Amino acid sequence: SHIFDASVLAPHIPSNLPDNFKVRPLAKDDFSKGYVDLLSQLTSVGNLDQEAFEKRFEAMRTSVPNYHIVVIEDSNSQKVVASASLVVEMKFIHGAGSRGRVEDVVVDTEMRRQKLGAVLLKTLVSLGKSLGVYKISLECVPELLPFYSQFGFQDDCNFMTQRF
Amino acid sequence: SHIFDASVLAPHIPSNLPDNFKVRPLAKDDFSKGYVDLLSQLTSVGNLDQEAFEKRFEAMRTSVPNYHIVVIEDSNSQKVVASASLVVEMKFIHGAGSRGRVEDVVVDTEMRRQKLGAVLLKTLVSLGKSLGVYKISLECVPELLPFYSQFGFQDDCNFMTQRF
Ligand SMILES: CC(C)(COP(=O)(O)OP(=O)(O)OC[C@H]1O[C@@H](n2cnc3c(N)ncnc32)[C@H](O)[C@@H]1OP(=O)(O)O)[C@@H](O)C(=O)NCCC(=O)NCCS
Ligand SMILES: CC(C)(COP(=O)(O)OP(=O)(O)OC[C@H]1O[C@@H](n2cnc3c(N)ncnc32)[C@H](O)[C@@H]1OP(=O)(O)O)[C@@H](O)C(=O)NCCC(=O)NCCS
Ligand SMILES: CC(=O)N[C@@H]1[C@@H](O)[C@H](O)[C@@H](COP(=O)(O)O)O[C@@H]1O
Ligand SMILES: CC(=O)N[C@@H]1[C@@H](O)[C@H](O)[C@@H](COP(=O)(O)O)O[C@@H]1O
Numbered sequence: 001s002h003i004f005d006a007s008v009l010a011p012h013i014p015s016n017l018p019d020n021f022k023v024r025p026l027a028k029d030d031f032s033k034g035y036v037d038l039l040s041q042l043t044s045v046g047n048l049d050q051e052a053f054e055k056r057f058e059a060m061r062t063s064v065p066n067y068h069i070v071v072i073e074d075s076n077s078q079k080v081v082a083s084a085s086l087v088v089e090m091k092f093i094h095g096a097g098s099r100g101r102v103e104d105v106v107v108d109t110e111m112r113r114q115k116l117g118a119v120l121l122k123t124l125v126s127l128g129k130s131l132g133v134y135k136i137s138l139e140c141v142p143e144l145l146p147f148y149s150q151f152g153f154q155d156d157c158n159f160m161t162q163r164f
Numbered sequence: 165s166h167i168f169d170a171s172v173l174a175p176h177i178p179s180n181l182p183d184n185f186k187v188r189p190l191a192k193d194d195f196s197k198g199y200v201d202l203l204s205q206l207t208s209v210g211n212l213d214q215e216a217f218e219k220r221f222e223a224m225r226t227s228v229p230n231y232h233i234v235v236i237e238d239s240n241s242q243k244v245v246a247s248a249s250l251v252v253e254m255k256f257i258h259g260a261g262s263r264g265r266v267e268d269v270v271v272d273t274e275m276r277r278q279k280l281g282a283v284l285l286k287t288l289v290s291l292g293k294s295l296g297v298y299k300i301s302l303e304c305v306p307e308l309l310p311f312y313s314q315f316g317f318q319d320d321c322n323f324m325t326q327r328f
Contacts, residue, residue, distance in 0.1 A: 039257055046259030056260040064223075067254070087253050090231070093203055093268065095210025096220040104257065129328050137325045139301075145322060152326040158309060159323035161301040162316045164293050 001028040003057060004066035012126035014119050020075035023119060026083070028057050030071065034079045042106035065090065065098065065131075070123060072116055081108040084120035086128050086136075100124075100133035121151045166191055167221060168230035176290040178283055184240040185280075187287060190233040190247070192221050198243040199235070206270040229254065229262065229295075234287055236280050245272040248284035250292050250300075264288075264297035285315045 002025040013023045026035070031053045039045050060067040065088035072082040084105040088098045102124050107116045128136040139159050140148060166189040177187045190199070195217045203209050224231040229252035236246040249267040254260070266288055271281045292300045303323050304312060 036256075043257050045257055046261065048256060048259050052260045053256065056254060056256055059228075060254055063227075063254075089251055089265075089267070090220060090224055090227075091268070092199075092212060092217060092220055093207050093209055095212055096216045097210065101253075103253070104255070125326070133328065135325055135327045137303075137323060139321055139323050141321050145324065148324050153324035154326070156323050156325040157303050157305050159301060159303050159320050160309065160312055160317035161299055161320040162289075162318060163299050164297065 001057075001061070002026065003028075003061050003069050008066070009068070009070060009123070009127065012123045012130065014122050017115070017119055021081075021116070022073045022075060023123060024071060024073065026057070026069040026071050028054060030073075030080050033073065035071070035083070038080055038083060038106055038108055039104070041109055042104060068124070068127060069104075070120060070127075072120070074111070079108075081111045082106065082116040082120055084117075084124055086124040086131075088128075088131065088133060094134045097134040098132060100128035100131065100136040102128075102136060102138040105138075117147075118150070121148070125151050165193075167225050167233050172230070173232070173234060173287070173291065175294065176287045178286060181283065184238050185245075186237045186239055187234060187283060188237070190221070190235050192218060192225075194235065194244050197237065199247070202244055202247060202270055202272055203268070205273055206268060232288065232291060233268075234284055234291075236283065238275070243272075245275045246270065246280040246284055248281075248288055250288040250295075252292075252295065252297060258298045261298040262296065264292035264295065264300040266292075266300060266302040269302075281311075282314065285312070289315045 004025050006025055031050050036045050036048055068086040071080045074081045085103040087101050091097050145155050168189050170189055195214050200209050200212055232250035235244045238245045248269040251265050251267055253263045309319055
């Protein structure tokens, strides 16, 4: 069970990259392949157990637009070592267009500088373009502007937040 | 008919608003109350005609999480004069939490400086708190930082975009 149809993803996955990496949608059994621990490296996972994972996974799976949560399993360890998400918001502006957002980009602490992050970003950009979104966006610290610039992004206006 | 359940919105609507003004969900017949012209003051509406508007309305009305597109009608002109959207993304982070985003804030040019924008932002923040979101965010030109800081927002990291 994949969180979105792998056939949607197949055209956008870059050609290079070694085996033993599989780029694919998030699978329901990725909880048992270390997905929470990977997400912990990005921010707090709070109280997410398998059961809450599975319920959320199903809620996302049956969403349209899909949650395009794309992961990289390293076949050796049977672990998920990178994740990045493209989520899409429907709009009335731009001819009832849609806006893409890249979220929750994480590459496992032991597996950086192996182009895992670049592969995910290239894949999501290609996917978003193909899905027809008029604009794709993301949020990062200024030190990552040159990272994401590589994939066609450029610094835009202010981003404001508040937490509860 | 309403894009989401008005009883969801009721607790968040401020008391004491001039009698001519009704805060409520976007309604399918708002196309005939100038909603496209209102949106055009924000940005391009592209080829949005009634059929496209209705078809998109229905896709949004049936979405869970809902699209909380809140508008204010001037019932003395029977036109929608202001709109703002709270949209919600499901997450696995933060105990399968959710993120709220404030989008497409527009107040008719002739109806500015009458607090409509503050009403809508006050309402959406209150709504988003009550929905349980862990973080609400928005994007704006720097000139609007002190505007949106009134509703609890703070300048955060960078926001990067790519248009297709
Ligand atoms: C940021 C992150 C997503 C990048 O993922 P990665 O898989 O380690 O990145 P890569 O090693 O694939 O880097 C890919 C390309 O980006 C370039 N690059 C990497 N980081 C860069 C950066 N921060 N700024 C500019 N270019 C960068 C590299 O030169 C490489 O290109 P190349 O193959 O042409 O030389 C990941 O490392 C990461 O750490 N994520 C968590 C957040 C974090 O630590 N951010 C850094 C704090 S500033
Ligand atoms: C900004 C906007 C969304 C909403 O507001 P509006 O209904 O016109 O709101 P008002 O001007 O009536 O302001 C409401 C409150 O916020 C305050 N406010 C407005 N702008 C402010 C600012 N820039 N900084 C601090 N407070 C501000 C007002 O003083 C008022 O406070 P009060 O009731 O305690 O006195 C609306 O004016 C708009 O869409 N404008 C077009 C976009 C725009 O101006 N972009 C910036 C280009 S530089
Ligand atoms: C491009 C990218 O990966 N951006 C992420 C965002 O998607 C994630 O939700 C947040 C988690 O941090 P938080 O727990 O403080 O909100 O960090 C970054 O802004
Ligand atoms: C808080 C707010 O209203 N932000 C809006 C955003 O929601 C809207 O989608 C975009 C339209 O501009 P665009 O057509 O250039 O993307 O403008 C602003 O960033």
